[model samples]
Target: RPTFYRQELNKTIWEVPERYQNLSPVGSGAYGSVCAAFDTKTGLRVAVKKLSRPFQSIIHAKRTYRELRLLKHMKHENVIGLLDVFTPARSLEEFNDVYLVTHLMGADLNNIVKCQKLTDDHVQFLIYQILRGLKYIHSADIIHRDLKPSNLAVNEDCELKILDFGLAATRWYRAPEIMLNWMHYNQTVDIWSVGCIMAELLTGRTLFPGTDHIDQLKLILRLVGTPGAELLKKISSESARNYIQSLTQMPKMNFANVFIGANPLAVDLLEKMLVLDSDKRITAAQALAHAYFAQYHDPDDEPVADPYDQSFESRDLLIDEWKSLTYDEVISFVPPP
Candidate 1:
């Protein structure tokens, strides 16, 4: 839940003004916190996330700046909007946190998934929206390291929005060969996580539920079967012995029993994503074109339910009929029934 409170603060679009008293801690994470604020000129409500810039590390600062940069340029129904940002002053000799302004949205997709048994079309729509978000992210060559269920936000009307690119489990999602330290990772790592997320959504369970790091590997081996000699050769040499030994013992899953009643096309897509051989993993763009999404996806042409549409608000001066802005904007902005 977001902390909502009203406070007085003066913020610049690209710089911080003197003594802006921030109020209401709406959200918090490893890096910093977000607060709900109002636009003085427009009197619109918005959420601002404050990023604490690290000292002596220009690279970290650049990355953090890039995140806001990317979000600011992105315009879509499913992507969070970055309305504006406030940068720290140069001569202050102090580390004041920078802030990025966006809107407060609803809960994550993971929370919603627990309560819904998704129909085939629902799953397809979810996957399609995910792919659309990924396509937008990839267009800038930005790797959204974390693509898990919890990172996706869903509003009341089932509009799926992708959130959080703070950190990625890059190395963990690579193929056995890549894990063998055989190759470099790229955007495909995200695709693998997306695949895992889809499977979890389908079964309402984690595909590999291990107690720890080793346990996760053990669970995966149990399902995918051990890495064969050829597979081991391609996979990291450091873990080769363990891989061979893992293969020596057969895994427990036959794949079908897990997906049980899931749509075959969904199963097919999941397999392609979780394949031990990373070389064959589907790319984000390719996944967009996959028959699975194409077959069942309904574009945003249908009248979206009010609940979903309410999740995202127009970022600019949202005016109606060119009338002067007044208290009646709320009452006058009624949709035609």
Candidate 2:
């Protein structure tokens, strides 16, 4: 048996059941604390994330809903598997917490990239899996707004899974269109993040390690060269458009020079995926078929259909309304393996 809660702030902070025994803290962030534990029922190691004040704000409510719904609907090897979701509250009235049960991996890409010197095979396989996961989600018209090293989990065996879909548009990995406030965006935005991750893996550094949005855009302009008149016109933010237009035109740097020791084909793939224009950026499916991934490509792999259509639609709701909707989702959800 495991201790569900320790005394804290004069309340019994809720935790997963005793079956998830030998609890030990793994990581913590703005969202919640994560624990690595042994699942006595299934004899497996799992990560239980206790989301903090999930319904406290509209943003928190929406993220809680999206992550839970998407994890339940998605069924791919490369995507994080949601084993279970539970709350200790006996009634709907006491429900203020959310727990997400997912498979525990040895490490995330952030740790791996920092410590390990990746070989060509490692880079190729990891990138391949990233693209494979994106392909599955993109086919269902889903965009993983977050795709950074920290969000990507990897085991010692080189198997990878994407995590943390809380509408994550982190400045470092965010697509240029998003930065420019372009309306009617699509899956291509994810490709740009993937491109950033790929670059990080290759060089052991962030491609555009920007401190803020403006600085990030400036770094992008410096690297990829300034967007042409056609792309500049599509930017929705007048200030962002004027700011970018005022910058001096930059010459494109060869990918070979940036990603030293990277293969020619690999660099080519990065160039394709990182294009400033979303229209020109390579699709996950297209990237998978590229020569860089040829050795790892499998024809037998297929992406499944979205489990629920209505759940995918974007909605605007008041904080309390979002709370009600989240509770409804929690009670109605059926776990899938």
Candidate 3:
């Protein structure tokens, strides 16, 4: 008469709702471990993530709750949607782990980029799909914060879904504002990440691979050119301002020259997204409307999620507090149609 399926594989315990079966380990990371399973209720493949040690620390607890809150409320075609959430533990005492079930997807951009020979059409469609999804995300008052190739997933049909909703990624895909001025940054940070991903798709190489944080700034300034004192004024950190002012201002490189033989419109969008000034950078909505996407852009398909309450993100809560809050969300969640 058990309502849950309990199993131990590879020294890790998994407890899921009984509707899923045949869990096979797909991957593992610091945050959680994933397994691929078939859903008996829906008759579809699903990837279930077992969040590891969620309540062990304050930061981890907050991230777990935030993703749950944000993702559960999101409704986007190109964004990874939550299917179901369950825990082996019933009450607060038993709720140490969470299982997140989402649609199973093919290789992520990290793996696909390495082996695929992409044409210009593939690149345009891929970037267009990402921007389309991003517009929805920004309209809902959330910043992906992390938008690298790895975090972007693609299926056999070449459909793209923005994976992982954390607040940061590797320095290569990080925006200048995030590096220089971490506080009070906005949605443009995602634009910067899209620019990096766009360039990589065009050139088949990593752009802005900084050796360190200091070098990260150097790589960005080299390509975009040093921001004028006018733009530097936006950064609140005196040390960050002084750091940029001290560097030798390299002239911005011509996009065509940097990305040889690329479409002119692609170059234009790239420049617009890589802007150093947070205020001046292209937005997700604006990028979707650029001439580069004119052929494929469908105004009808572009949609946005409803505004979400983000007060939880700013609160300083203890592990127990975060856990109970997350539990409330899990129990109350109603699966979307």
Candidate 4:
């Protein structure tokens, strides 16, 4: 037998059914708490994430909608899946809580980077899985705006899963186009994040630990050098362009010097990923085909995950109407087939 509890927060309350046992908190953030528990019904361990005040703000509402919708639609080995979703409230009037059940992993990449010892092979395999996940995401025309170490969950077997898609974006791993407002970005932004994350793993430190957005750009300039003439003209913001012009011109650091003891092919892939021009940044699929992964990749074999299907795109809803659309999406989602 297990116990049921009505958890209260502010003016909202929800219940956790007793089917989950041995609950222990794993992590928490502005979103909510994640707990590791044993699922008595299925005899499997799972992670339960209870979202915090999803409807409290428009931003929160929209993010909750995307995270739930995307997880329901995406099914891939490298991406996190939604095992179950439940809320104690049956009607919208009382629906203030949302709980998501997902796979339980030993640790996130952030903890792994700080605690576990890694080898070059480990780095290669980890990055390979990340790119595979990115390939699946980009194929669906979805940009994982936030790709950081903490969001990547891994287990003892070295399998990696990308998680936390609150329509989130990371400043530290953000691309040059994202920083300068040079132009709107696309999937290439994710590649830039991959570059930053790869560098962090190799160096055992954040590639750019800036105090603020401006400092982040400054650190990028110091490490990768100022964008070239062709890249600079693309900047849509006059102030941003002027700011870059005012900064001292610096040459790009040699990848060899930056990623010491790294494989030559690995350095080549990193260079492609960290390109200052988003246009030049390697696509996830292209990176997977790079020589660094030549031994692992087989051009003849297609990805087991379903191919990109345009039918999946919810084009009926306009950008302005996303909030309302998302509200309905969350209420009616079914797990991926």
Candidate 5:
């Protein structure tokens, strides 16, 4: 049996195995409290993140289950690795919170990105890693970071991953369909965000930032040019389609003009990704195959996983059912296989 001791701090109780010792505060958020600790079993550092009031609401409870389930299956260097999971509760009814152990890491890009820290070679490496990791999860996504050896986590080894850090994608990283309130957008939206991210990384600033939803679409049009009116049929909202059609249908801004002095290959990749039509956007796999990554691309290392089963998202289950299922994951937890 695993031995656990109760640790109380910041008004939260953490029950973890004795092997995880020397805990200190890392940070806290609405969803969890994260701490840094030493895992005596391996003599290496680890991060302990406690899920707060995980079962307080049906919505939040399901979200907790979804997140744990997803992370448990993630296995790639450019993705957050699940090391272990545990909870103080011994049984189903006793379980209300969970402690997730992950590799001590940082960077969602929003916090650490800057032009000064990212040079040309490093930028290529960073984009390569993002595309490499995305290839592993065909149905996956990431948007947004760069810079100091001690100042930022990615700078240490220049490692970046698609960590689930934000409550929502910032509008700047959001795709046009989402901003337009389209009901049936697909994974291609993720491709659009990657395009926007690449642009920001090259230009050293947000590509199509706006003050609000309306202005965001306007600015996106200003740069990429409005989509052809024929594409309006795919949008679910008549008002949105009308709104899009009414916008000035200007031609797309020249890539050379937009990303002045950027690598020709890089510019070509961005054009393929940032297209207004999601159907035409370059996929993660295709993007990885693009000549821009030709120098580093290795098909063997960039294996793709089967499409994710998303049926569980809408499956009806009581809070207890979710608790029992989530508890199962905690007990069976082991490092990435």
Candidate 6:
């Protein structure tokens, strides 16, 4: 039988105070405001996301339920834990009602990446954890649209957890299919976003911070060639047509060389996640099997039970053997202030 860990002092919506609503803002989100509050009965800090939009329509009510439903079954270390759900005890329209209560975690990935002097080891560790969490989320068939640094929270233990599921993939990281015709995308979109995140983590800046659609598409097209007719068909719209016409030729940048002192395994993993063609993109499970992980992975921490501990000859290493990693080597070339 499966064991369920029930939380104690589960306060009902009616028990919470209107005055207790006096919480300092934690951060701004897609919907309403989120605030850090103390759950008096539980004696734990919780981040309450309050959405006060006009819910006159049934669709709005359903959307409110949708966020809760997604949170209920979502159980991942790299994900923010949903503690409870709150609906107003009274009528249908409580302007300051509809809150999502979750744990009080640490700073976001945006803040970490924004900080100066993160070594290569830090980057590799973060990338591995993010990919691991993403793999779990995708296995459940959930797509996280918004996946920027701010949405990814890093706890005190230095673990990277994904937060903010509102916008799955920012337009910047949308694959060719979504770019050209807005094809129905799935987990692959998240993988693409992770790739962008990895890039930002290494460089400490936004990879494609374009302000408009035309500029954004042009940036991607320049890096990865214009999608052919088959790829274009996936986008499926006329607005994309006008934008695609304005794109410049592909860029000559050597993206693989972005990280100077990191393990070759890191680059190999990054390449797989950022593949231009969504169909050829590497799935999370497949990522765990790549040769670069052979030496670096912690078997106790990985997802699989007793993962294969294969030994390899030095000559057959996946990445350059001489390029072993170190902190000093990685951040040496950071731009001077």
Q: Which pairs of residues collide in candidate 3?
A: none
Across 1-337, the per-residue lDDT of candidate 2 in tens digits comes to: 2345542322436456778777777775336778788988889999978887798887888777777777777788888877888877666788788888888988888887895567888889999999898888877667777677887888988888878753553579888887777656778898898889888887888888888777888888788887767776766776666777688888777888878878899899989988887777788888998998878998588465465564534688776777677677777877664
The segments of candidate 3 whose C-alpha lies over 4 angstroms from its true place after superposition are 28-30, 115-117, 166-169, 232-235
Residue lDDT tens for model 6, 39-109 = 66567676877664514344343444445445655666776657765444343222334556777777887
Residue-wise C-alpha lDDT for candidate 5, range 159-249, written one tens digit per residue: 8766552223246767777667775665667667677777777777878778887877788888777665666566678777777767777
**Candidate 2 deviant stretches above 4 angstroms:** 1-12, 311-325, 331-337
* Ranking of all candidate structures by their lDDT, best first: 3, 2, 4, 5, 6, 1
User: After superposing candidate 4, which stretches have Cα over 4 Å from the reference?
Assistant: 1-4, 7-14, 115-117, 299-337
lDDT of 4 by residue, 122-241 (tens): 888899999988888887777877778888889989889988743652478877787677777878888999999988887887888888888888899897888777777777787787
lDDT of each: 0.57, 0.78, 0.83, 0.76, 0.71, 0.60
- Model 1, residue 197: displacement in angstroms? 1.2
Q: Which consecutive 10 residues in model 6 have the weakest lDDT in total?
A: 319-328
Clashes of 6: 11
TM-score for each candidate, following the candidate numbering: 0.71, 0.88, 0.92, 0.86, 0.87, 0.72
Off by over 4 Å in 6: 1-22, 88-96, 115-117, 166-171, 174-176, 227-246, 251-253, 257-262, 291-337
Index of the highest-TM-score prediction: 3
Name the best candidate (by lDDT): 3
Q: Which pairs of residues have clashing backbones in candidate 4? A: none
Query: Model 6 — TM-score against the truth?
Result: 0.72
Residue 179 of candidate 1: its Cα lDDT? 39
Backbone Cα, N, C clashes tallied per candidate? 6, 0, 0, 0, 2, 11
